[PDB]
Structures are given as C-alpha cells and as structure tokens.
Amino acid sequence: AETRECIYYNANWELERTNQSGLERCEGEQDKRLHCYASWRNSSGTIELVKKGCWLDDFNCYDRQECVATEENPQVYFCCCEGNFCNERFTHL
Amino acid sequence: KSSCKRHPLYVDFSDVGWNDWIVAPPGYHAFYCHGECPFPLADHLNSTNHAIVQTLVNSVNSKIPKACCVPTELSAISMLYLDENEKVVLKNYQDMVVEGCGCR
Amino acid sequence: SSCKRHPLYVDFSDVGWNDWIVAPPGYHAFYCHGECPFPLADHLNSTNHAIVQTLVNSVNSKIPKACCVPTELSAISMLYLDENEKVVLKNYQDMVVEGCGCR
Amino acid sequence: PFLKCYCSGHCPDDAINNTCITNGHCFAIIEEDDQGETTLASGCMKYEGSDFQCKDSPKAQLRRTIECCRTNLCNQYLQPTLPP
C-alpha cells in the first residue's frame, strides 16, 4: 500500500483544539491515490496561511509534484499535489 | 431499458450554484446508478436476499414493484468550504462517489 | 407518496418454496417504495450521494432522483429437509425490511 | 438523540403528535410547484449532508426556500418565504 505524508497546518488550531503545525500521515482506500494540499489568503500582498494537510484522491491533484493554485483571483487560494510533503511550498498562477 | 450499472455524472458546483462557499474542488465525478433489476436476477448483479425474494414475488404479482438499482459501494472526497462566518473548513465527505451498483 | 415501507407477506406456497422449506409457511418481508424528494428527511437515512443527486435532479431533471430501497434488513431462520429427511435449521440474512430510505 | 422537531409532509412512520426525533436539524420549507401552487412542509434532517440540504441550490428549477434551525421544536418559528 502506497504511503503518503503531508505538511500539516491549521490557523484555527485553537478554536479547533488541534496542533498548529506538524506532519500528517494520510490514509486512503485501496487503489486510491493520496494527495496533500495548502490553502491561504493573499490580502494586500501579505500571504495568510490557512490550512495544509492530506487530501483524498482527486484528479485535480494527479501527478503534480508542486502545489500551484489554479484559480485566477479567489478569496481563498488552494492547491493540491501528489507527493510527500509536496504542500511544503506553494505558489499562485 | 438497460441493466443496473454505474453511469457517468460530473457534479459541477458552479452549475449547482455553490462556487461561492466551496473553495475546492470545482466539482467531482459522482456517478449514479441506473438500470432494471430483471427476473431472474443476474448473478453478477450485487443483490440482497430481500431483493431476490422481491424479484420473485414481482414475477407473479405485478402489484409488487421490482428491486431498485442503487449505490452499494461508495467512496469519499475532501472538500474545503467557507462556513457562515467566512471561515475555511476541511471535511472529508463520506459516500460522495458511487464506486459500484446493485439491486436492492 | 414519499418513500416508506409497505406491507408484503411472502407465502412460500405462492412462490414454490414450500416443497423445500418445512417452516415457516411464509413471512413478512415488506418492501420499500415512494418518492425521494427534496429535502431527504432524517428517517430516509440517505447517503451524501443521494442528497447530492436529489439536488442535481432539482437543477436538471435529466438526472434521476434517488431511489427508495431497504436501508436496514434483518434475518430469519428457516427449517429445511436434509437429504436424509433430517430437518435442518438455517439462518438467512437480509430477508426482512426493517427500514426504508433514499439511496 | 438530542433534538425534537415538528414535522408535516415529512414525518417518519414513528411520528407522534406531528413531531420527530433527530440528531441534526429541524427545517421548514415553502415550495411552488408546476403551477403557482404553494405548500409548506417541515421535519427532521440528519446531520450528515445537512450543510448541502439547508443551503439548497439556487439553481433549482422550481421556486422554494428551505430554512434550518437547531434547538428543540424550533421549526414552528421558521417562516420561509419564496425567493424573488
């Protein structure tokens, strides 16, 4: 069974009673791909990290080693990828 | 017309009008189940003892409906969305994608 | 007219099982039938998929509504004749509809 | 089970006094069918999938407004109005 680990981050760790950052071991169903993701806000050029973690099999993340947002100008950016800790760094485009 | 099986279905959140609270994904392949559950119920058809009994009954009492083709195996997908307070939330929604169908 | 459990007594002599089954003579199997409308209430124990499909159907009628089927079934034991005239007791799962819902 | 709700049109078979028990939400909905005919209904909604159902789809072909609430018998106070 393929293993996957992602960077974990939660800006609302407090109100959610969770760690703020760390590592997350992903668990997937059989034959299902495993991904990581990052989400953040970009207000006034200042990047505000919202969440990072594991993400279930989703074709939008297939075979991407880099985590790149695929939405022009959203209020909340998102990217996902397929590789261990591939959400460590992220960019827009 | 056709036998009970999986059919394609892409749910596009913009078309449902949810692209404002769902940050990701833009949509997903949900699929659906459709098709007849004919007598005698085909082996390869995933069928419960009840569906079998009902199918037999329907063969001699048309007032009793046939079994129905529905999802018997499903998988989850992750979604990222904004709650009432514009706060970002992660949820792995279970049973969102039809993996296999059967007569029930 | 919405999804619910309906009566259905299965008489074994009516489906040709009485020559095989010594007891009981038949049993209450029930069946599920009815519309899966929006919204799907609690007692329909619907999956997220059925919920999403109902909403898509409401947007596009080309996509069928969810279907009313048994969401909980129970077992019943039955007595059969062994090739020795030996009455054998066997349990059969999923024979009786305990609850109906939209899937 | 923590929540009791009024139900009408959506009552389960074990409904007593037009109320139902759930662990999710109570809801009320107003709907306009093929004809300008309006009808009101209410009941219990399981927690699972309630975000989808309470939000509903603004692209539904028929006009309707569903509202949700989460305290005991609360849906008697929901008075949904059709969308413009």
Author numbering:
A (entry chain D): 6 to 98
B (entry chain A): 11 to 114
C (entry chain B): 12 to 114
D (entry chain C): 34 to 117
Tell me what the authors wrote about this structure, in their words:
Members of the TGF-β superfamily bind two different types of serine/threonine-kinase receptors termed type I and type II receptors. In the present study we analyze the interaction of BMP-2 with its type I receptor BMPR-IA and its type II receptor ActR-IIB.
The crystal structure of the ternary ligand-receptor complex of wildtype BMP-2 shows a dimeric ligand bound to only one BMPR-IAECD and ActR-IIBECD occupying the expected wrist (type I receptor binding site) and knuckle epitopes (type II receptor binding site). Both receptor ectodomains are located on the same half of the dimeric ligand, with the binding sites being almost identical to those identified in the crystal structures of the complexes BMP-2:BMPR-IA and BMP-7:ActR-II. Inspection of the crystal lattice contacts shows that symmetry-related proteins block the empty epitopes. Superposition of the complexes yields an r.m.s. deviation of 0.3 Å for the Cα atoms of BMP-2 (in the ternary complex (1:1:1) only "bound" parts of BMP-2 were considered), and 0.4 Å for the Cα of BMP-2 and ActR-IIBECD. The H-bond between BMP-2 Ser88 Oγ and ActR-IIB Leu61 NH is in the center of the otherwise hydrophobic epitope, whereas the other polar bonds reside at the periphery.
